[PDB]
């Protein structure tokens, strides 16, 4: 026997599946045996989001992350309420069909709708923060819900809603903070060469880790960081990128403003040491901010400086540069192979989300009917999911609040605009190592402290 739901004229989610309203990919959902939805009408997507035969957490997460391109939040809420409010089938002059229908259609579907509400309110509360009437409707819907089967879920949702309306310590000992020439508390002395290179890399890894972790899927889905409201919609991604840009520029600046050749060799050498430690910490954002600086046009051309760089550090830099080659082939493989904690380079994720959204249609047409292309969204949710997997695990390192401050308040550009500043860096590069055939000038030393590095190995045991 089948089941006998009401007519589509009374309840729109009764309509049978056809090629005109829902289509599937030829393969089956990993771990779980569920079919993979390729496309469907919004009604069918909502039917399957709250399906009676089984639960589908994968579809729920993916849907709630990506739905806003095809369905407004208010529309989603209206649809899941409509889904919830299931009437009974009509004549049977009187209960064989009904007790079954209540227990195997109504009760499961209603539980699935509550589960959707719960995940929505827990993981995507921003829809509600941004539209208070959406929260009003959700609260009066949840207050409407009646059954004893439902009570425990309704209570739980109401608890999450209250928690959401409201305004680190380690596994075991982190390593000892490292000091070189600048002593603790003497922030006025802090610079590239005066701080310990290990601690530079560690404290930058902490900043960049927190920056990486604050970025939410709401800043990425719909490619919103590239649109006119990017500062409104992607503030954390933007702070993260700006920090990375700042440090690349700071490295360039430290290099080309060190006019004395010997001193400049020590500066470049020290930056490569910092790269070495980034690499040990799996801070790939850090790695790439160094590689970008070395590849910058003001730095890359300084052949007299790189000539004096010891071969060991030449090789470290080369290996790091090769991560970026061939569309990040080696970066991609290295990232896959390492274990958290890490700090990914975000730029790849950005490009892939954009291209995914741009290179696939919003809808597919079958027999003249428009179906939402869900597989497109799945692809985007895979990428946002990969980003989140590297956000869970923090670093086991002690913050030093003064060094943290110094790198947070770093401003190599000053009051200058980009063009003005990068032309200045390049003219500086030309001054300190002119083009052939012009001979190399000499320049006086600027650093009154010793240039020798303490190296990149910890000073004390455990």
């Amino acid at each position: 026997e089948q089941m006998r739901l009401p007519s589509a004229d009374v309840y729109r989610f009764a309509e049978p599946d056809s090629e005109e309203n829902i289509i599937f990919e030829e393969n089956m959902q990993p771990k779980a045996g569920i079919p993979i939805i390729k496309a469907g009408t919004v009604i069918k997507l909502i039917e399957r989001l709250t399906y009676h035969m089984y639960a589908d957490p994968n579809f729920v997460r993916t849907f709630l992350t990506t739905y806003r391109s095809f369905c407004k939040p208010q529309e989603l809420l209206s649809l899941i309420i409509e889904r919830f409010e299931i009437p009974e089938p009509e004549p049977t002059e009187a209960s064989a069909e009904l007790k079954r229908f209540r227990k195997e259609y109504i009760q499961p579907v209603q539980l699935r709708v509550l589960n959707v509400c719960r995940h929505w309110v827990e993981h995507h509360f921003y829809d509600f923060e941004r539209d208070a009437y959406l929260l009003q409707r959700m609260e009066e819907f949840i207050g409407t819900v009646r059954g004893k089967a439902m009570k425990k879920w309704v209570e739980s949702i109401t608890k999450i809603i209250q928690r959401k309306k409201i305004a680190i310590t380690f596994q075991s000992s982190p390593p000892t903070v490292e000091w070189h020439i600048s002593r603790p508390g003497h922030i006025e002395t802090f610079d590239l060469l005066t701080l310990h290179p290990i601690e530079i890399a560690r404290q930058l890894t902490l900043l960049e880790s927190d920056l990486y972790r604050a970025v939410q899927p709401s800043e990425l889905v719909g490619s919103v960081w590239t649109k006119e409201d990017k500062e409104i919609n992607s503030p954390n991604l933007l702070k993260m990128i700006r920090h990375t840009t700042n440090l690349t520029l700071w490295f360039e600046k430290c290099i080309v403003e060190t006019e004395n050749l010997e001193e400049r060799v020590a500066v470049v050498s020290r930056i490569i040491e910092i790269l070495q430690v980034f690499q040990e910490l799996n801070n790939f954002n850090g790695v790439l901010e160094v590689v970008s600086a070395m590849n910058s046009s003001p730095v890359y051309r300084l052949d007299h400086t790189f000539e004096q760089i010891p071969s060991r550090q030449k090789k470290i830099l080369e290996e790091a540069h090769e991560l970026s080659e061939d569309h990040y082939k080696k970066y991609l493989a290295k990232l896959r192979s390492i274990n958290p904690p890490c700090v990914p380079f975000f730029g790849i994720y950005l490009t892939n989300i954009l291209k995914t959204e741009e290179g696939n249609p919003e809808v597919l047409k079958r027999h003249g009917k428009e179906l939402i292309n869900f597989s497109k969204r799945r692809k985007v949710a895979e990428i946002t999911g990969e980003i989140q997997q590297y956000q869970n695990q923090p670093y086991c390192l002690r913050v030093e609040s003064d060094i943290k401050r110094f790198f947070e308040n770093l401003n190599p550009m000053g009051n200058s605009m980009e063009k003005e500043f990068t032309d200045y860096l390049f003219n500086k590069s030309l001054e300190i190592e002119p083009r052939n055939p012009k001979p190399l000038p000499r320049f006086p030393k600027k650093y009154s402290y010793p240039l020798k590095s303490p190296g990149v190995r910890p000073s004390n045991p455990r």
Binding site: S296, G347, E358
Partner: protein, 169 residues
């Protein structure tokens, strides 16, 4: 088989993506996964010479402004793309060209100007303005429509031609 490393550059909100996506993807499939190697590599015959295009499009990474040199340094030829409905993207072209010349350390880098039409708003950059700019740089200008695929092959094949005319010299 000769391989040409091409680099696409331009402002955000512009259709750079669409340009490269439309080149790579089959003429009649609207499917694209940018993670795999076939996403950005394509074999083509241009003037009866089979060759392999490797296209770098970092669309989405425009805020990483200090990485432009890194990315540009990888290329032999460049598509400098602007959108015909965004005057600012057109005005930024001179900066991109200048930065490419600086990175490649050459006054004569293989380069094409590409003006892309997608969807509304309407045109703010007449083709004549772009023909004039292209002429002042001594480079070709190609206008494309992402959605209809008009101009896409021509843009890329013209850049490859520019690279060949640069290398025979």
């Amino acid at each position: 088989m000769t391989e040409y490393k091409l680099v696409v550059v331009g402002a955000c909100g512009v259709g750079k993506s669409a340009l490269t996506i439309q080149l790579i993807q089959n003429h009649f499939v609207d499917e694209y996964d940018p993670t795999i190697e076939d996403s950005y590599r394509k074999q083509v015959v241009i003037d009866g010479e089979t060759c392999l295009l490797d296209i770098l499009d970092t669309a989405g990474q425009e805020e990483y402004s200090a990485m432009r040199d890194q990315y540009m340094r990888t290329g032999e030829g460049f598509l400098c793309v602007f959108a015909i409905n965004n005057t600012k993207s057109f005005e930024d072209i001179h900066h991109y060209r200048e930065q490419i010349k600086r990175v490649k350390d050459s006054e004569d880098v293989p380069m094409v100007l590409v003006g892309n039409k997608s969807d509304l708003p309407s045109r703010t950059v007449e083709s004549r303005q772009a023909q004039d700019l292209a002429r002042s740089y001594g480079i070709p200008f190609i206008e494309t429509s992402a959605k209809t695929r008009q101009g896409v092959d021509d843009a890329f094949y013209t850049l490859v031609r520019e690279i060949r005319k640069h290398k025979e010299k």
